[PDB]
């Protein structure tokens with residue numbers, strides 16, 4: 821209109837959510853509980869010698 | 874000095890050695906097993922805390 825140009829109003833997103841990126845250390849000692857559980861049950865068997873004889 | 878007598882006497886000695894040897898073997902084996910069990914128990918107890 822005349823010399824000036826008119827532009828439409830811009831709609832705005834109401835909310836934003838922040839989810840930052842985190843470094844991944846990738847440690848291996850955690851989630852190894854099964855090995856500890858296996859260590860718990862060694863179960864060495866010893867039979868008395870001389871009771872039979 | 875009967876020929877059977879000094880043989881019976883050696884037969885007496887030739888069995889207490891076996892009995893005592895068996896007893897000492899059992900004692901040693903049981904002690905070793907108890908030591909191993911104590912070591913593994915302490916190792917597990919120390920191992921849990923560092924993981925946590």
Ligand SMILES: *[C@@H]1O[C@H](CO)[C@@H](O[C@@H]2O[C@H](CO)[C@@H](O)[C@H](O)[C@H]2NC(C)=O)[C@H](O)[C@H]1NC(C)=O
Pocket residue numbers: 842843844845846
């Ligand atoms: C939290 O744990 C999850 C599951 O272990 C990890 O997600 C894995 O990440 C690796 C590396 O990018 C991928 O190869 C796997 O496919 C992912 N698995 C799943 C189920 O998503 C995640 O990386 C861990 N978070 C941190 C910060 O270490």
